[PDB]
């Protein structure tokens, strides 16, 4: 089956990037071409939809250091991104609300992709959502987390997007979200492009979809702009004013 590969990234505006990402999710109609989107964000902390900013991050350190706060539309915990972090989102038709199985199948895809790069990894073991590593939504290179993910479902559509640490500043990560995380490049000598290419092939093989490069539609673009103008660009959305 043919998919859409969207190489669609606004690294200098994380809030707009997130607007793009709900936009593609919400524009999706059951039976549409499944979407695989790759993107990076400059220095940024992205918190879960339901999180209290000042409980989860050092907002004073962040402002002092020019790190953008951005709230995403999926739940889950807070993460630090920079240009060393590769993000990706998968939107597909859905006939059920079995989110566990979604994470399971996307993690298989990620594991297959990393195998291509010579890196052995598994999904974490634990259900406890509050713990920092080894969750079933994490991907673990042994004891170290190298990737986390969040997702959402509605009638007819699912979304699952993930942040992979390729060559992220792990010291900035630890400072802003206040030994357990690692970069992919701590294990194998690879570029972001090589990682992206492995993920394309791995997701294609695992999901049996051929993701061909495409652009966003006028409808997807206009919704993203609306979501940004009315929501993602605002302090109320991000800070929860
Ligand atoms: O590590 C976690 O537990 C949450 C991962 C959230 C991934 C999002 C991908 C696009 S924005 S941040």
UniProtKB/Swiss-Prot annotation:
(R)-lipoate binds at residue 145. Residues 30-211 form the BPL/LPL catalytic domain. The keyword Magnesium applies. It catalyses: L-lysyl-[lipoyl-carrier protein] + (R)-lipoate + ATP = N(6)-[(R)-lipoyl]-L-lysyl-[lipoyl-carrier protein] + AMP + diphosphate + H(+). It is found in: Cytoplasm. ATP binds at residues 72, 77, 80, 85, 132, 135, 145, 149, 163. CDD domains: LplA. GO terms for cellular component: cytoplasm; protein-containing complex. It holds the Pfam family LplA-B_cat. Pathway: Protein modification; protein lipoylation via exogenous pathway; protein N(6)-(lipoyl)lysine from lipoate: step 1/2; Protein modification; protein lipoylation via exogenous pathway; protein N(6)-(lipoyl)lysine from lipoate: step 2/2. Mg(2+) binds at residues 137-138, 149. It comes from the Archaea. Keywords: ATP-binding, Cytoplasm, Ligase, Magnesium, Metal-binding, Nucleotide-binding. Its main location: cytoplasm. Its EC number is 6.3.1.20. Part of a lipoate-protein ligase complex that catalyzes both the ATP-dependent activation of exogenously supplied lipoate to lipoyl-AMP and the transfer of the activated lipoyl onto the lipoyl domains of lipoate-dependent enzymes. Can also use octanoate as substrate. Belongs to the LplA family. PANTHER family: OCTANOYL-[GCVH]:PROTEIN N-OCTANOYLTRANSFERASE, OCTANOYLTRANSFERASE LIPM-RELATED. In contrast to E.coli, where the lipoate-protein ligase is encoded by a single gene product (LplA) with a large N-terminal domain and a small C-terminal domain, the same activity in T.acidophilum is dependent on two separate proteins, corresponding to the two domains of E.coli LplA, respectively. Heterodimer composed of LplA and LplB. This is Lipoate-protein ligase A subunit 1. The lineage of its organism: Archaea, Methanobacteriati, Thermoplasmatota, Thermoplasmata, Thermoplasmatales. The gene is lplA.
